[PDB]
Design a protein around this nucleic acid. Sequence first.
DNA 1: CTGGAGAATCCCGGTGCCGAGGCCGCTCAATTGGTCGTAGACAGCTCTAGCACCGCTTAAACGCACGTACGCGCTGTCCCCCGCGTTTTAACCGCCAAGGGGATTACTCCCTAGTCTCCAGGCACGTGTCAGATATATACATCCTGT
DNA 2: ACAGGATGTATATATCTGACACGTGCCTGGAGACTAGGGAGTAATCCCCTTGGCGGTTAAAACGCGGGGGACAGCGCGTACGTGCGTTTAAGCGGTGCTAGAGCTGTCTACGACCAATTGAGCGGCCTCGGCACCGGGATTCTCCAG
Lengths: 109, 109, 148, 98, 97, 94, 94, 80, 79, 64, 63
Amino acid sequence: ARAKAKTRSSRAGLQFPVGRVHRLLRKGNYSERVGAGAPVYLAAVLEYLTAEILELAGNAARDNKKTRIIPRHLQLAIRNDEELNKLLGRVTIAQGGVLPNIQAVLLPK
Amino acid sequence: ARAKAKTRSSRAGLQFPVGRVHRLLRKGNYSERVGAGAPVYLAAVLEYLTAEILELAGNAARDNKKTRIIPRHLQLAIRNDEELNKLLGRVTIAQGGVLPNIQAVLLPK
Amino acid sequence: TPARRRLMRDFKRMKEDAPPGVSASPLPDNVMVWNAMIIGPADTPYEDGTFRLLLEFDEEYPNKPPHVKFLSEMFHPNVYANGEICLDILQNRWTPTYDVASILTSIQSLFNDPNPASPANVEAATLFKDHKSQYVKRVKETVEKSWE
Amino acid sequence: KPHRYRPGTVALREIRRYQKSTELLIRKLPFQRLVREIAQDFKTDLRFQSSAVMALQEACEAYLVGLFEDTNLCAIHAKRVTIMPKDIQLARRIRGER
Amino acid sequence: PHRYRPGTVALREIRRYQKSTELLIRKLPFQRLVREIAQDFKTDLRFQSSAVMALQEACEAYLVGLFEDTNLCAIHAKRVTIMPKDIQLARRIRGER
Amino acid sequence: RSRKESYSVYVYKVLKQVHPDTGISSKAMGIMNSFVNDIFERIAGEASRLAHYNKRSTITSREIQTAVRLLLPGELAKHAVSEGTKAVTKYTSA
Amino acid sequence: RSRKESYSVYVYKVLKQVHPDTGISSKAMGIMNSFVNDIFERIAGEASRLAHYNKRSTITSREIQTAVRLLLPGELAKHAVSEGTKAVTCYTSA
Amino acid sequence: LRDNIQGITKPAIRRLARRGGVKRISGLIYEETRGVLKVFLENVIRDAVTYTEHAKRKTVTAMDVVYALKRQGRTLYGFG
Amino acid sequence: RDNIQGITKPAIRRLARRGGVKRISGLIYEETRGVLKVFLENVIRDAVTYTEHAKRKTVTAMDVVYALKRQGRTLYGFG
Amino acid sequence: EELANFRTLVYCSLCSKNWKNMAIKTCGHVFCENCCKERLAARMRKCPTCNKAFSSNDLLTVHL
Amino acid sequence: ELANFRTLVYCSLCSKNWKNMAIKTCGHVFCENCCKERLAARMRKCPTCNKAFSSNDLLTVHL
DNA sequence: CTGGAGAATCCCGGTGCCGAGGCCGCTCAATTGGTCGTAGACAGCTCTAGCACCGCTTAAACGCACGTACGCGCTGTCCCCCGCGTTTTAACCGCCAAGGGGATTACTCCCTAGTCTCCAGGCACGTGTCAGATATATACATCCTGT
DNA sequence: ACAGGATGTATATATCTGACACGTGCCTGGAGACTAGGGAGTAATCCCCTTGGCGGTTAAAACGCGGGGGACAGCGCGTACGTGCGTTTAAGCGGTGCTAGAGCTGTCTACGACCAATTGAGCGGCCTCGGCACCGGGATTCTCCAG
Ligand SMILES: [Zn+2]
Ligand SMILES: [Zn+2]
Ligand SMILES: [Zn+2]
Ligand SMILES: [Zn+2]
C-alpha cells in the first residue's frame, strides 16, 4: 500500500521500456555505475530511430499496395533514405534484395 | 619476514609484466572476474608479437647500415611481412613513409 | 605419404643402428606409435636403468614437434614427473632434420649433462644442485624402481 | 519463321527480374554440401543448424552481388560492357581484400 | 642545351619521394586550413601542435593511399595519366561515395 | 522453458502509432529486433569509451548524447538529440 | 608531477634479447607502445565478447586462447598460442 | 565431400551477376567467382567453428555465423 | 577563407609521386583538395565533439587519435 | 660411402630430395629454395646449421 | 656420375680448386683463386652468363 | 524512319490457407521506499603552453614558352558470348526413423575478490658520449643525342 | 646497337651535436598471506532437432548450334602536360612577450548501488479469419522485321 507503480517509460512519455534499457546497461559491463537519465535518453533515441524506419517502410509498403511490412520494404526504406543508408551501410538484411538500378551505359539507344 | 618476492613474469619466464597486465585487465571493465592464467597468457602473446616486430625492424635497420631503429624500419618490417601486414593493415605509422614499388607499365621500354 | 616414408626410414634406423643404451621401434600396425626404453648411460647414477618411453607420432612429423612420453616415472630438474621432458628440440626448437636416433642420443646425453636452466621439477633441481647426496640416493632408488 | 530477340534484350529483362525479387539464387543443397566440405578442414564430424547454413548463404549472395556491382563499375570504367576477371581483381584490390 | 625527355624526371621524383618520410605539405597553410575547417563547429578553438601534426600525418597517409588506388584505376583503364574519373572510381569502390 | 526477451511489443506499438492501419511480418519483426539491439550496442559501447576516456565511472545522459552525436549522421543526430533531451526533461519534471 | 606508465623497459629488454647490438629511437618506442596498447585492447575486447557470449563472468586463459586464434592470422596465431601455453604451463609448474 | 565448388553453377553465377546489374559476362569469370566464394566462405567458417568449439559443442549455430560475420564488419540482420 | 588553396599544385604532385603516379591531369588539383577537405571535416568534427565532451577549449592530440580510431584509421606515434 | 657423402653435399640436408640450389647470404650455407621458403613460411628465421638470424633478402639462388 | 660430381665440386675454370665463392649478380659459384685471377686480369665478366662482377660481389659458400 | 506479329507483361477475378493478430494465466522483472558511502561538481592556484608579432633567409611556389608524348576518336576483323531448343540430371518435397547432443538442474569445491603489510622494480631527473646528420670532393652509373 | 658528354648519384672523409643509454633516489604498485563466498565443473536426465534414407515430379542444368555485337589492335591527330628558366612570395626559424586555460588539490553534497517487499506487464500457449499467393483468363505494351 505504498503507491500505484508508474513506469519510467510513461513518466517520460515513451513507448520503449526504460527499465529494460537500464537493466541491459547495468549488466552489460559498460561502466561501474549508470546514471538515472541515461536509460531515458537511450530509450528515446531508440524509439525515434524505430519510428523513422517504420514510417519509411510503411510508406514503401503502401507504394506496393501491401498492408504488411516485409523485409523488402525495410531494405527499400533504408537504401532510399540518405541518412539511414549511411547509418546502416555495412548491414545485410535477410530477404531484402537490392535497389533496382541499371547503369545508363547498358541501356539501349 | 614472509618470503622474498618473486615476480609473476620471472616465475613464468617472461620479460613483459604479468602484474601490470593483470591490473589493466581488472581496471578495464572487460569482465567481472579475471582468471589467474589470463595475464600470464596475454603477456606472453604480447612479448611474442613485440619480439617478431623488433626482429624484423632490426633486420631492416641492418640492411640500411644503421644500428638504431627508426619508424621507417618499423614500417618496412611490418609491410614486408605478409602476416604482420594483414594484422596491421589499417594502421598508419607516423613518419613511416611507404614502400618503393613502381608499376611495371610506367617503367620505360 | 612422405611422412610415413620418413617414419619407415626411422624404423630402419632405430632397428639397425640403435645408439648405445637406447632403443626405439614403431608398431608394425602403426608406425606413428613407438614404445622405447633407454639403458642408463655410463658415468651416471642413472646408469643401466630401464627407463621405458612411449613415443606417438602424427602426420605433422617432422614439420611440427611431436610428443614423447615416458612409460617410466621421472624425477629430474628438466623432466616433469608425468614423463614429460623440458626440452626445446621437441618443445621450442623443433627441427625436421632431427630423427628418432638423434633425439634418443640427445636424451641420453642430457642424462650425463642436465640443463637446470630449464627447470621442470623444482624439487629435483634443488636436490641435484644443493643436496647432491640426497639427489644421488633418490636417483638410485628411482633407477632401482625402474628395474623393478 | 523462328523468333529471336537481339542479344541484350533478355539480359536486360532478367536484370530487371532479378533486381525486383528477393529469393536465393544459389541452389540450397549444393551450397550446403560446399559449406560442409569447407567445414571439414577445421573440425571433423561437425553438425550444422539449418538456420546457420541459411545465414551463411544469405551472407554469400549479398557479398557476391556487392562484388559484381563493383566489378560492373570497373568494367564500365575500362570502357566496355563485358565484365572480365581483371575487373574482379581490381575491385577486390581497391576494397582491400587482395 | 640538355633536356630530359618527359617521364624521366617524374620517375626520379617517384623514387625520391617513395624513399623519404618527410611531410609533403607545408605546415602553416595546413594549420590555417585546419583552423578554418574547425571554426564552423566551435568559435575560437585552440589546437595542440601535436594534434595538428597528427592531423597532417593522417591526411597525407590517406591521400597517398587514395593516389595508389587511383593509379591502379588509371592503369586498368589502359592509361598512365590519372584523372578525376579514376579518383571517383576509387572513392566509390572503397565505399566513400 | 526459457523466456527470451525482445522488442516486439514496443516496435508494434510504434508501428500502430505511426501507420495505424499497417501490419508487419514475423521476419520483419526479427530484423527490427536486430536493428534495435545493434544500435543499443553501438551507443552503449561508445558511451563506455567516452566515460573511460574522461576517467569517469558513471554513464550519464551527457555521455549518451555525445555518443549519439558521434554515431548518428547529420539531421538524424539533430532530431535524436532533441528527442532525447525532451524525454529527459519530461522524466525529470514528472 | 603525475607518473605515466608505458612498455619502454620491456620493449628495450626484448630488443636487447633479440638484437643485442641494436638501439632504438625515441619515436620508434612511442610506436611500439602504441602497438602494444592496440593489441592489448583488441585481445581484451575479444575475450570480453567471448565471455559475454558464453554467459560467463570470468576471463580465463581459454578466452585468450580463442581471442588470439580469432585475431592473429595464420602461423602468427599458431606461434602465439604456443608461446602463451608454454608460459601458462611454466607459471603453473613454478 | 569433394569437388562441391562446381555445385555453384554457371547459371547461378549468371543470376548473381544479373542482380548486380551486369549486362554481359565473360567466360573466364565463373572460375574466379568460385575462387572468391571459396575464400570468403573459408574466412567466415573458420571464425564460426572457432566460436563453436570455444563453447565446447559439436553443432554450429546461427549465432556463431552471425558473430563471425559481425566480426568481419558485415553485420547480418534477421537471424538473432 | 581561401586556405584550401594553400594545398598547392606541387604539394599534390609530390603526394601523387609518393603514391606512385607517373603523370597527372590538370583537373585533379581541384578534385583532391575537395577530397582532402571532406576527410578533414569528417575527422575534425569528431575531434571537437570529443573536446566539448571533455569540456575543454583545446583540441589535444589524443582527441585526434580517438577521432581517427573511430573511423578505422588508427594512428601510431601520438599516444 | 663416398657416394653417400656426395649425396649429402649435393642434396638439401633437410629434404634430402632436391639438389642444393639456394644459398644464405649471411652464413654461407646453401639449401633448396623449397626448404628455405617453407622455413620462412614457418616464421623460423634462423639458420638450420649455424642458427644465425636471416631474412628472405639474405637468400640468393645458386647454380651448380 | 663421379666425373659429374668432380666437375660440380671443383671450379669450372680451374677443375682443381673447390667451388667456394658466389657471385651476387649472376648466382654462379666458382673458386677464390679463379675469381681473383679474373679480377686482376680485367676478366670482370662472368664465365657462364658474361655478367659483370667485382670484388664486392664475392660471397663465400660453405658446403 | 513507320506499321503488324508475337511474346511478355500487366490487370482483374475466384479460392484456399496459414500466419498475423487478439486473448488468458502467471511468473518474474520492474517499481517503491530507505540507507549509505563515494563520485563528481565546484572553487582556488599554478605555471605550461598556445597564440600573437617582427625581422631576415631563401626555399619553394608561380608564371610562361615549347614540344612531344599520350589521350581519344575512327575503322576493321573475328571470335566469343548470347539466345534457343532438346535432353539429362539432380534439386526439391514429402514421409519415416534413430540417436547424438543441446539444454536444463543439483551439488560441491576450488578459484578468485577483498584487505593489510612490506619492499623492490620502475619512474623522474641528470649527464656524457657516440651514432648520425651535414659539407665536400670524388669515382661511378645513367640518360640522351649523334652515329 | 654503340660511344661520349653532362647530370644526377653512391662513397669516403672529417666535424659537430644532441639524443640515447646509463646511473641514482624514492615511492607506490606488485607480491605474500589469509579469509570467505559463489562460479563453474561434473553428473544425470530429457527430448528437440540433426542426419540419413527412399521415392516421385519436374525444374533447372548442360550441351549444341548459329550469328552478330563488342573487344581489341592499328593508325592518325591535336591538345595539354612535363620540363626548364626566371621572378615573386611567403614558409620557416629565431626570439620575445602575454595570458588563457589545462592540471592538480581539497571539500562536500547529491546520487546511484544495495536490499527488501509488492504487483502488474509481458511471455508462452492457444485459437481465428483475412491478406495474400496462386491459377485462369483477357487487355496492353515492347521488341523486331518488313516496308
Ligand atoms: Zn631441401
Ligand atoms: Zn648458417
Ligand atoms: Zn677455379
Ligand atoms: Zn654468371
